[PDB]
Design a protein around this motif. Sequence first.
Motif, PDB file in Angstrom:
ATOM      1  N   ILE A 185       1.793   1.311  -0.250  1.00 61.42           N
ATOM      2  CA  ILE A 185       0.525   1.430   0.457  1.00 61.42           C
ATOM      3  C   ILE A 185       0.544   2.621   1.404  1.00 61.42           C
ATOM      4  O   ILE A 185      -0.469   3.312   1.555  1.00 61.42           O
ATOM      5  CB  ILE A 185       0.176   0.119   1.187  1.00 61.42           C
ATOM      6  N   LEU A 186       1.686   2.899   2.047  1.00 66.29           N
ATOM      7  CA  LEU A 186       1.700   4.022   2.988  1.00 66.29           C
ATOM      8  C   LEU A 186       1.324   5.346   2.326  1.00 66.29           C
ATOM      9  O   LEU A 186       0.321   5.959   2.736  1.00 66.29           O
ATOM     10  CB  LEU A 186       3.046   4.107   3.717  1.00 66.29           C
ATOM     11  N   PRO A 187       2.048   5.840   1.311  1.00 65.83           N
ATOM     12  CA  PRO A 187       1.685   7.153   0.754  1.00 65.83           C
ATOM     13  C   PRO A 187       0.307   7.188   0.115  1.00 65.83           C
ATOM     14  O   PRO A 187      -0.414   8.180   0.277  1.00 65.83           O
ATOM     15  CB  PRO A 187       2.797   7.415  -0.270  1.00 65.83           C
ATOM     16  N   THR A 188      -0.088   6.134  -0.604  1.00 62.87           N
ATOM     17  CA  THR A 188      -1.407   6.151  -1.229  1.00 62.87           C
ATOM     18  C   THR A 188      -2.524   6.064  -0.198  1.00 62.87           C
ATOM     19  O   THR A 188      -3.564   6.706  -0.362  1.00 62.87           O
ATOM     20  CB  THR A 188      -1.541   5.038  -2.271  1.00 62.87           C
ATOM     21  N   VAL A 189      -2.342   5.290   0.873  1.00 62.44           N
ATOM     22  CA  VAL A 189      -3.391   5.263   1.888  1.00 62.44           C
ATOM     23  C   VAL A 189      -3.487   6.620   2.578  1.00 62.44           C
ATOM     24  O   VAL A 189      -4.588   7.099   2.877  1.00 62.44           O
ATOM     25  CB  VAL A 189      -3.178   4.108   2.890  1.00 62.44           C
ATOM     26  N   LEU A 190      -2.348   7.283   2.801  1.00 65.47           N
ATOM     27  CA  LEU A 190      -2.387   8.612   3.405  1.00 65.47           C
ATOM     28  C   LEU A 190      -3.104   9.606   2.496  1.00 65.47           C
ATOM     29  O   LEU A 190      -3.956  10.382   2.947  1.00 65.47           O
ATOM     30  CB  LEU A 190      -0.969   9.089   3.716  1.00 65.47           C
ATOM     31  N   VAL A 191      -2.776   9.584   1.201  1.00 65.57           N
ATOM     32  CA  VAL A 191      -3.362  10.538   0.265  1.00 65.57           C
ATOM     33  C   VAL A 191      -4.827  10.215   0.006  1.00 65.57           C
ATOM     34  O   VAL A 191      -5.605  11.096  -0.376  1.00 65.57           O
ATOM     35  CB  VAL A 191      -2.539  10.570  -1.038  1.00 65.57           C
ATOM     36  N   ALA A 192      -5.231   8.959   0.199  1.00 64.77           N
ATOM     37  CA  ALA A 192      -6.643   8.616   0.090  1.00 64.77           C
ATOM     38  C   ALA A 192      -7.412   9.082   1.317  1.00 64.77           C
ATOM     39  O   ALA A 192      -8.557   9.536   1.205  1.00 64.77           O
ATOM     40  CB  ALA A 192      -6.803   7.109  -0.108  1.00 64.77           C
ATOM     41  N   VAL A 193      -6.801   8.973   2.498  1.00 63.92           N
ATOM     42  CA  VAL A 193      -7.487   9.386   3.716  1.00 63.92           C
ATOM     43  C   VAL A 193      -7.629  10.903   3.772  1.00 63.92           C
ATOM     44  O   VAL A 193      -8.693  11.424   4.126  1.00 63.92           O
ATOM     45  CB  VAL A 193      -6.759   8.835   4.955  1.00 63.92           C
ATOM     46  N   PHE A 194      -6.573  11.640   3.417  1.00 69.66           N
ATOM     47  CA  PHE A 194      -6.540  13.074   3.686  1.00 69.66           C
ATOM     48  C   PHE A 194      -6.386  13.952   2.447  1.00 69.66           C
ATOM     49  O   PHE A 194      -6.099  15.145   2.590  1.00 69.66           O
ATOM     50  CB  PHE A 194      -5.422  13.394   4.682  1.00 69.66           C
ATOM     51  N   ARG A 195      -6.582  13.416   1.244  1.00 71.11           N
ATOM     52  CA  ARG A 195      -6.463  14.223   0.035  1.00 71.11           C
ATOM     53  C   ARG A 195      -7.416  13.686  -1.024  1.00 71.11           C
ATOM     54  O   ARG A 195      -7.925  12.567  -0.923  1.00 71.11           O
ATOM     55  CB  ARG A 195      -5.020  14.251  -0.482  1.00 71.11           C
ATOM     56  N   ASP A 196      -7.659  14.502  -2.049  1.00 67.89           N
ATOM     57  CA  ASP A 196      -8.590  14.156  -3.112  1.00 67.89           C
ATOM     58  C   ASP A 196      -7.835  13.649  -4.339  1.00 67.89           C
ATOM     59  O   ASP A 196      -6.611  13.494  -4.336  1.00 67.89           O
ATOM     60  CB  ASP A 196      -9.485  15.351  -3.460  1.00 67.89           C
ATOM     61  N   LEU A 197      -8.587  13.392  -5.411  1.00 69.12           N
ATOM     62  CA  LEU A 197      -8.023  12.711  -6.572  1.00 69.12           C
ATOM     63  C   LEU A 197      -7.128  13.627  -7.398  1.00 69.12           C
ATOM     64  O   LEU A 197      -6.222  13.144  -8.089  1.00 69.12           O
ATOM     65  CB  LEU A 197      -9.146  12.134  -7.432  1.00 69.12           C
ATOM     66  N   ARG A 198      -7.369  14.939  -7.361  1.00 69.54           N
ATOM     67  CA  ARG A 198      -6.469  15.860  -8.049  1.00 69.54           C
ATOM     68  C   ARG A 198      -5.065  15.779  -7.465  1.00 69.54           C
ATOM     69  O   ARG A 198      -4.069  15.855  -8.196  1.00 69.54           O
ATOM     70  CB  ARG A 198      -7.005  17.289  -7.970  1.00 69.54           C
ATOM     71  N   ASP A 199      -4.968  15.614  -6.143  1.00 66.31           N
ATOM     72  CA  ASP A 199      -3.668  15.374  -5.531  1.00 66.31           C
ATOM     73  C   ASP A 199      -3.063  14.070  -6.030  1.00 66.31           C
ATOM     74  O   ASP A 199      -1.843  13.967  -6.181  1.00 66.31           O
ATOM     75  CB  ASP A 199      -3.787  15.358  -4.007  1.00 66.31           C
ATOM     76  N   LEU A 200      -3.897  13.060  -6.289  1.00 64.38           N
ATOM     77  CA  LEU A 200      -3.384  11.811  -6.844  1.00 64.38           C
ATOM     78  C   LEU A 200      -2.795  12.029  -8.233  1.00 64.38           C
ATOM     79  O   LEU A 200      -1.728  11.492  -8.559  1.00 64.38           O
ATOM     80  CB  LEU A 200      -4.491  10.759  -6.896  1.00 64.38           C
ATOM     81  N   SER A 201      -3.483  12.811  -9.067  1.00 65.56           N
ATOM     82  CA  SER A 201      -2.962  13.109 -10.398  1.00 65.56           C
ATOM     83  C   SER A 201      -1.650  13.880 -10.314  1.00 65.56           C
ATOM     84  O   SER A 201      -0.694  13.583 -11.042  1.00 65.56           O
ATOM     85  CB  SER A 201      -3.996  13.895 -11.202  1.00 65.56           C
ATOM     86  N   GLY A 202      -1.586  14.872  -9.425  1.00 63.04           N
ATOM     87  CA  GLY A 202      -0.341  15.599  -9.236  1.00 63.04           C
ATOM     88  C   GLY A 202       0.778  14.710  -8.728  1.00 63.04           C
ATOM     89  O   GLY A 202       1.937  14.858  -9.128  1.00 63.04           O
ATOM     90  N   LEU A 203       0.447  13.771  -7.839  1.00 63.47           N
ATOM     91  CA  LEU A 203       1.449  12.846  -7.328  1.00 63.47           C
ATOM     92  C   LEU A 203       1.975  11.944  -8.432  1.00 63.47           C
ATOM     93  O   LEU A 203       3.172  11.653  -8.484  1.00 63.47           O
ATOM     94  CB  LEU A 203       0.872  12.013  -6.185  1.00 63.47           C
ATOM     95  N   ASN A 204       1.097  11.485  -9.327  1.00 65.05           N
ATOM     96  CA  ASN A 204       1.579  10.666 -10.434  1.00 65.05           C
ATOM     97  C   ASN A 204       2.435  11.488 -11.390  1.00 65.05           C
ATOM     98  O   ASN A 204       3.409  10.973 -11.953  1.00 65.05           O
ATOM     99  CB  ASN A 204       0.410  10.023 -11.181  1.00 65.05           C
ATOM    100  N   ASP A 205       2.070  12.757 -11.600  1.00 63.69           N
ATOM    101  CA  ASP A 205       2.927  13.656 -12.367  1.00 63.69           C
ATOM    102  C   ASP A 205       4.318  13.731 -11.755  1.00 63.69           C
ATOM    103  O   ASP A 205       5.330  13.590 -12.452  1.00 63.69           O
ATOM    104  CB  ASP A 205       2.303  15.050 -12.426  1.00 63.69           C
ATOM    105  N   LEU A 206       4.385  13.951 -10.443  1.00 66.94           N
ATOM    106  CA  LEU A 206       5.678  14.014  -9.773  1.00 66.94           C
ATOM    107  C   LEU A 206       6.416  12.685  -9.867  1.00 66.94           C
ATOM    108  O   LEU A 206       7.641  12.666 -10.011  1.00 66.94           O
ATOM    109  CB  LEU A 206       5.493  14.425  -8.313  1.00 66.94           C
ATOM    110  N   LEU A 207       5.688  11.569  -9.814  1.00 67.32           N
ATOM    111  CA  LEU A 207       6.313  10.253  -9.891  1.00 67.32           C
ATOM    112  C   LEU A 207       6.956  10.021 -11.252  1.00 67.32           C
ATOM    113  O   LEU A 207       8.096   9.551 -11.341  1.00 67.32           O
ATOM    114  CB  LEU A 207       5.277   9.169  -9.600  1.00 67.32           C
TER     115      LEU A 207
END
Length: 469
Positions: free
Chosen positions: A356-378
């Motif tokens: 919840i911590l990283p996803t809530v942070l990336v939801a508050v201060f980043r967009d969905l393309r960052d989410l896709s990149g984060l899943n790529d890194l994961l």
Amino acid sequence: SLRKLWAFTGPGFLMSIAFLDPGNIESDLQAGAVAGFKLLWVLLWATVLGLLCQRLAARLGVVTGKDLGEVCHLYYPKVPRTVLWLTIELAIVGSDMQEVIGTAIAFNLLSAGRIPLWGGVLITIVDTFFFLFLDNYGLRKLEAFFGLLITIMALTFGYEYVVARPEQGALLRGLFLPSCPGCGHPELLQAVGIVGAIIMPHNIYLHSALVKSREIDRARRADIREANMYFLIEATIALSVSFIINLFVMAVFGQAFYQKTNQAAFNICANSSLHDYAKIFPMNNATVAVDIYQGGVILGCLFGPAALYIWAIGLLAAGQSSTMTGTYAGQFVMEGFLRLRWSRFARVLLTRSCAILPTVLVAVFRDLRDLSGLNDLLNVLQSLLLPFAVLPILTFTSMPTLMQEFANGLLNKVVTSSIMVLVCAINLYFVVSYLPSLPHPAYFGLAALLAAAYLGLSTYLVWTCCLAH
């Protein structure tokens, strides 16, 4: 007999559910979007290697009566087990981030943009501790429930594939021919990602724990041989189901996504009324970088919004299933590497918090393309951590002390050594690609130290295996 197979049934659906985690969904999304049919042979080879690895896991677990966690606790000294346990912890929490982003995107798609991401993560953690509350009258085994769920999501994906109606002529070369002329480095990146994501490192421990469910009498060797062959048959069936669903999604996504430009898609499905069309078109002819949200909206705009709602339903089901399989896997890691022996509480608490911590942070201060990149890194991280889960099993089935008879043959030994050097070379090449990609020079030392620790642990495990070899 049919009754014996029915009694032995139940795990295979569980590993297949683990294979169908939302991280796998995003990985094949991107693979089909970029390389199309040229990576299906990679999927075949990775799937067959995963089947071999889970055959080894089932063999060890059935024959020895304890999970692989217990045996590594029994064998390795304190520091190696501690480091390796933190390795599975990192892999499993990465999988948890994957499935929570998947569930968040699915909830976003159901809401049609009304409910934001923080609402999605709060509702999914609410459902998680609701599953915890389910212990009020818990007499469940989950096998029928999640077989029904996996059949449901499989029927969704199969219906989507059949209404897409792809042509198998290109599929022939995609599945059979093991080459990719004309493609480049990002294709290699997504191939490594799909290789890592298809074979979850924690699934080895997961199966090595679920083997105990069936009553096995270790005194009679014929009975344990029959149990091993039954488990292998079940694993083969589950892996075949996973591969056919991945074949469906590969075919449809490659046919609907290859050489498609942003403005072309916008013109094609601008007559409809999704209202999500704003992000897709930056008025240029280029490759459409697509996440689950964009994939669902594109499918809905091309075929009908029914496609989107059912796609998001399948994503939510996959997310719930992956969350449950992660909870079980991590509980078994606890009992194997520390014998902490909790009942679904501490593992789920730590995993949901660290998600919840990283996803809530990336939801508050980043967009969905960052989410896709984060899943790529994961999923890249999962690929990097895969050898740390495939080498200990290699070692522990190597020596004959545990298995005087049911040891590894020479052919299996050399084949497994070949795959281990292959995956170590793949990891070396990927980290080599990563070295010049650091924007800040300050990260050089951290990357070097992390790589040194990784190579040191790998070399220690190789020394142990060659001692066992």
